[PDB]
Amino acid sequence: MVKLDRYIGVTVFVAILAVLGVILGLALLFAFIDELNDISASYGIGDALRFIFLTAPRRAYDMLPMAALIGCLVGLGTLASNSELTIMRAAGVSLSRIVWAVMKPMLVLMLAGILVGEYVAPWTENIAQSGRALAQGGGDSQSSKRGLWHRQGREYIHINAVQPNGVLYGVTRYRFDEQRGLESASFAKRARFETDHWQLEEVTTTLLHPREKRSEVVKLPTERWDAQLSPQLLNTVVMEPEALSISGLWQYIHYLADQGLNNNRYWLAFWTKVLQPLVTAALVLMAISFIFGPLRSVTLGQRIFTGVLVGFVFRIAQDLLGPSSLVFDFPPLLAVVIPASICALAGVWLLRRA
Amino acid sequence: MIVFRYLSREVLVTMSAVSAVLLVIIMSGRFIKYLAQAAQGLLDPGSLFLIMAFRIPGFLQLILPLGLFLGILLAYGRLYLESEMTVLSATGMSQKRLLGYTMAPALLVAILVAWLSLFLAPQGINQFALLLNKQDTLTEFDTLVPGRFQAMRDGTRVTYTEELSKDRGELAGIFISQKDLNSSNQERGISILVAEKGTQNIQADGSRYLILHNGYRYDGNPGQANYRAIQYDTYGVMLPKPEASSEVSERDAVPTADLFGSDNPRYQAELQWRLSTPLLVFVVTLLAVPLSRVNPRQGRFLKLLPAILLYMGYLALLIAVRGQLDKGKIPMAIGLWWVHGLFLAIGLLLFYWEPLRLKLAS
Amino acid sequence: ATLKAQHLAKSYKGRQVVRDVSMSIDSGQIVGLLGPNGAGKTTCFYMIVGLVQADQGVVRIDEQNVTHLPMHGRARAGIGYLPQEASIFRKLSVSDNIMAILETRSDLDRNGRKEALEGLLQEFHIHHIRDNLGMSLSGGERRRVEIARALASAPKFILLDEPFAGVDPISVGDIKQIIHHLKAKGIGILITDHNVRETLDICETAYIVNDGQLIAEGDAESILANDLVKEVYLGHEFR
Amino acid sequence: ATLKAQHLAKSYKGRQVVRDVSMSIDSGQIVGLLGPNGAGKTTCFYMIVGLVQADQGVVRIDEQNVTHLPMHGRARAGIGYLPQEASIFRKLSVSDNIMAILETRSDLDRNGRKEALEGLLQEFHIHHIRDNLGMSLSGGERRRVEIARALASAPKFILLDEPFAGVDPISVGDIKQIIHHLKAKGIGILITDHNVRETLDICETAYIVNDGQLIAEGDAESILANDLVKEVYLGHEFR
């Protein structure tokens, strides 16, 4: 059974690609419209367009499941409304065989989604966020929102802005004595990562003298810095959990585990980014169930409308079970399993009802 | 007259169902955003109930016109698919007469939306803001661990604490300082002191009387030869509630009677915006009638998504014009009325398409 | 009166579907319009009805050019219509399915409307279902109610569309009786149908439109014996 | 072979739409299924083919109980089906429509598939049009390609559904010729149709059902004289 497989696969693949293109275009348009409100001074229209375009792979990865659902609905509806699936079924081709034929060109889509969301999405998202932060500002010691604070037994660290290419903008160092005696008001602009030390740049330090001498400014060009911070550690904290690579999410979850702080949002992000193929499979199984049942001979518009409505109902529930799993106390795995599980159960029920 | 009642009762029910579905979807969409802030611990998750009950009148002001649009589309598409209107136009019924029939159920929606937008939404928004300001600021101050200290966004309240406490007694000690010197170019910009005090003396909604008997000021501008170090008492830390200012504004709660006479451009743009949804209803009703003509192959569920897109674009244009007009950029004589004129023109060119083609056919 | 279509023409995406077809229906006649499925039979029928705008030619009813008039303008001019699919007012009683049209008449006052409703309800023998809703009516009575409703507008011509399609052989007698009654009332009738046996049985003059042209015309005997219609439409073994 | 259906029964809205109807089609004869529109003719046909599950029934193909098998399960034992509407694979050539179904069969190798495809293409006189897309075929050749595709799966009974619906009187001769061709091979057809005049001609045994009960059966000359059918379905003046 080769020609039927290729026919159904090509149909559903093209339909899914078209739906994904339309959805991505709409999402980018809405995001640009929202971003227009913050155009002031340095944040020109060109920078906003660059940021919107660079955040395209993340949106495509996010909208892949809904696109797959709607595309499968449309592609199978084209065949069903022309009374061709009935011919296939009457020729001896089973129903599970048709489901397998539809899902054969869809493992490719799931694999592409995983690959583009673990290798391509984090890079572009990081570049776009850093560029937007730079365009908006961050000149002063505490100007940009993309800041962080780190402390040791006495060392105080504040970073005004972090760069994707292992660079910090606005390095600030302080030293307080055992009796809370101030000892340093260091300032820096850039830093380069070599070995484990941190090659600071534009070191405008200001060290306080205890007894009577007022501090002095030493404009040393560069100085190795003894900090346990790693560029991956400072990059991971800045980015939102829903925009991190799977390996990075796993490593950060474990690191948070070591220090004793509970991890409940990174776990949810990890489960969401890992169980995406299963959610896609459940959604498209339910779509196939829909085609063989209620939406058999209805028009294309009704299928599109039903797909969009159910996609809204599903995405709203998925995004509503997230914060609820953190306000309350139940494993985040439920927040990812429950909606896809009930979608698959309903699809199987309707398919068995034929 | 029988046809009039039939059409009105066929349109109103569909409008009601579509409006209910849209209201449920919008309420869920707002809940998924308030629950995130609840998960951060900023707001009590027991008051989300009221906030919805106080904000729903503000949703049944942009939902009802869209409900009417979709209801007219669906109802007249259903009547068109079953040849129910072919035999109505084959016994004599102008499309102008159909518009006249449809304009009566639109009048009820216009009256309801005018009431909700001029006398109910402001009261509800005012009550919601009042009750969010009153007792929901108790969670303004939240402490996680001694490792995560306090760094207020004001740029002047940064300090250190040891192990926190539920009774707020073990988190003493203060290293407060404005600390906006960068390269230490100023002296008055730091209020550094050494303290083991800072008892949580909460009297108002977070306001603290944290006077410290332990403190040594280090005013002396670092990097220079001027050493100026004296005793420092404390820096008062009163905690206000900025949640309300982040989400809503004062304009949306002003009673209509306070906007009839005013010179503030914002207080007049608000009045021009409030009187825009009653005209929204009529404009979308005019747009809906020519669109609803469908073929059996198209079905009634085809132009629903473009209709939603068009309505959202209309609302976005209204809001953008209002926001660029209350700044004084656009003189308050054109107002938002040119948006309504544009959409009325694009509806009129659609209601007069077939007659125009027939006339051009000579 | 006289409904005339002269030199009708149309063209869909390049190809010319119809060209120079001339038909004429007098008041009281029963004229049938038949032809091969792919030809311009349905295009000509819908061009006379008003759902398709003619590229050329005129359609006039007794010196009244109604070519460039909408469907409602034609209906006020005198031309009726009755679609093939079920087109009864579902959530409306039978007595209201007719009154909803009788209320638009200008020459009828309050008492005249009731009198005409009673006349139409008694003429077609639907007095017993005067209260039943339109959606609960059977197949046989739905057509009677639709015909009475279309007659409530006092049309001068009725253009039936596939009356016999999907109809049992026992229910074509009722449809033929209704059509004969309508002819007796003086209303000219135009019929287009796929079934060419009952249509030729009932119609008095028939037109064949093949390849977009009027290949033959005349009564049943002269149309069943023509060679062109017997070698492009009917086949050499038709009766 | 014999496709005997015994004691069929069904109910949709708690009401016995079809009750106690039994039909039997030998392999090598053409059997018609007729009746009024509201009766249980379409329901019985769909229960026989398999699209509608039967609450009771002993549907068996020569001592092979297949009442519980799905549509594909029934078709594997060999039961054809041909939808009334167009069911051609749109974006596939004629030579691909047959080959796609041929590849389903498990008793053919590559050379066997090729030989069978050429045999089917030459048998139905569609060798010239072996590259046109299925969506670009006229109604005359679309039906031939559909029947060739249906025969490619090698069934034992073909259940046609409304073959003579919406066709010209010159296009029923081709369908009758194809049905005679199928009958010659050995397949047993089960034509069901709204039109009666030639359905009772091509077929040689009819099972007329009314009110969901078998009321009569037998040859055309032996059913046209039956009083019950002439009272309920055929009327008192048919033929």
Numbering used by the authors:
A (entry chain G): 1 to 354
B (entry chain F): 1 to 362
C (entry chain B), D (entry chain A): 2 to 240
Task: Reproduce text from the manuscript describing this model.
The IM sub-complex comprises the ATP-binding cassette (ABC) transporter LptB2FGC, which extracts LPS from the IM and delivers it to the periplasmic components of the Lpt system. LptB2FGC is a type VI ABC transporter consisting of 5 subunits. The LptB cytoplasmic subunits form the nucleotide-binding domains (NBDs) that capture and hydrolyse ATP. LptF and LptG possess transmembrane helices that create a cavity and a translocation path for LPS, as well as a periplasmic β-jellyroll domain.
Three distinct conformations of LptB2FG, designated as LptB2FG-I, LptB2FG-II, and LptB2FG-III, were captured in our cryo-EM data and solved to resolutions of 3.34 Å, 3.26 Å, and 3.31 Å, respectively. The main difference between the three cryo-EM structures of LptB2FG is in the conformation of the β-jellyroll domain, which appears to perform a rigid body rotation motion with respect to the outer leaflet of the IM, transitioning from one conformational state to the other. The TMD and NBD domains of these three structures are essentially the same. In contrast to all the reported structures of LptB2FG determined by cryo-EM, our cryo-EM structures did not reveal any density consistent with the presence of LPS within the outward-facing cavity of the TMDs. This cavity has a volume of 5,473 Å3, approximately half the volume observed in the X-ray structure (10, 513 Å3), suggesting that the previously solved structure may represent an LPS-bound conformation. Intriguingly, our structures of LptB2FG exhibit an open V-shaped cleft at Interface 1, oriented toward the outer leaflet of the inner membrane, while Interface 2 remains entirely closed. This structural feature is expected to facilitate lipids entering the TMD domain of LptB2FGC via Interface 1. The distinctive structural attributes characterising our cryo-EM LptB2FG structures strongly suggest that we have captured the resting state, or substrate-free conformation, of this transporter. In the LptB2FG-I structure, we observed PE1, PE3, and PE4.
